[PDB]
Amino acid sequence: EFNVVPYYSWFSGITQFQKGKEFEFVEGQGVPIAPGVPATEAKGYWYRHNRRSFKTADGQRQLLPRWYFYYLGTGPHAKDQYGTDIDGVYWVASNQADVNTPADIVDRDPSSDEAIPTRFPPGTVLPQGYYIEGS
Ligand SMILES: CN(C)CC(=O)Nc1ccc2[nH]c(=O)c3ccccc3c2c1
């Protein structure tokens, strides 16, 4: 969880379960499906939530990262330039998207909307070592 309120993603998270496997998508893929959004707005980034646990007194490690998707110009990196090398950020965009203008899309009031469970179109190459939440 969090003890500082996050920007909330329109979608469910993707969670690492195998250490050492990278988070990635093929260029053009990796934008989660949202009913009615045009491919020109299908642009943004996945953002890594580092999680950390507590020591139990039986010794006991691991609580891997979970990634959350944010449309370009929103989220904790609402200001950065698409593409920019930033630890913990992975940019993705449909090939119809112009990544020079922010997506025209409001954040998600977590109280007047649940997260849309994360799906991808047929053919999307899923990152091995990750489990899509809600699936
Ligand atoms: C290292 N952490 C401070 C980063 C952070 O927690 N990121 C974070 C950032 C994005 C998050 N997006 C969500 O949709 C969400 C939903 C339920 C609970 C948490 C989140 C959520 C959390």
Automatic annotation (TrEMBL):
<feature type="domain" description="CoV N NTD">
    <location>
        <begin position="6"/>
        <end position="134"/>
    </location>
</feature>
<feature type="modified residue" description="Phosphoserine; by host">
    <location>
        <position position="111"/>
    </location>
</feature>
<protein>
    <submittedName>
        <fullName>Nucleocapsid protein</fullName>
    </submittedName>
</protein>
<feature type="modified residue" description="Phosphothreonine; by host">
    <location>
        <position position="118"/>
    </location>
</feature>
